Ligand binder design. Structure first.
Ligand code: W9F
Length: 134
């Protein structure tokens, strides 16, 4: 009975576009870009009361965030950035802003047909990562 019901579940990466260029823009170094770009993560989303948990599991890294919408938290990203994150729901889209070293990136997650579409933006550079139910 929402929040976020249509996001909850276990999702597997099925396509990616422009992720190397997005990672370059973020500042990810060569070796991490190569290994991270190979990964085929599973994204596991769950909700318990007001707390949303998003796990990413791959051969590269396992990460986990738990958060309340609108409430800032500290996140260590898969590429080892120490960021301050805030996630909100905007018109049915989860909007995740990460701030670090005067920089910012925004990750949007939305349901489109049977997919979960993730759009990662850093300045002018967008990467689109498509997940399907596992
Ligand atoms: C693990 C992952 C990510 C995101 C940004 C960077 Cl920069 C890196 Cl290295 C890895 C990913 O591979 N794909 C998605 S959609 N979410 C993530 O949390």
């Amino acid at each position: 009975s929402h929040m976020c019901d249509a996001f909850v579940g276990t999702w597997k990466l099925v396509s990616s576009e422009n992720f190397d260029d997005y990672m370059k823009e973020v500042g990810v170094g060569f070796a991490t870009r190569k290994v991270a770009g190979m990964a085929k993560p599973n994204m596991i989303i769950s909700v318990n009361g007001d707390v949303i948990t998003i796990k990413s599991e791959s051969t590269f890294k396992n990460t986990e965030i738990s958060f309340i919408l609108g409430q800032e938290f500290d996140e260590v990203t898969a590429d080892d950035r120490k960021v301050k994150s805030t996630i909100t729901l905007d018109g049915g889209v989860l909007v995740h802003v990460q701030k670090w070293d005067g920089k910012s990136t925004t990750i949007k997650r939305k349901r489109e047909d049977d997919k979960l579409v993730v759009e990662c933006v850093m300045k002018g550079v967008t990467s689109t990562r498509v997940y399907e139910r596992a």
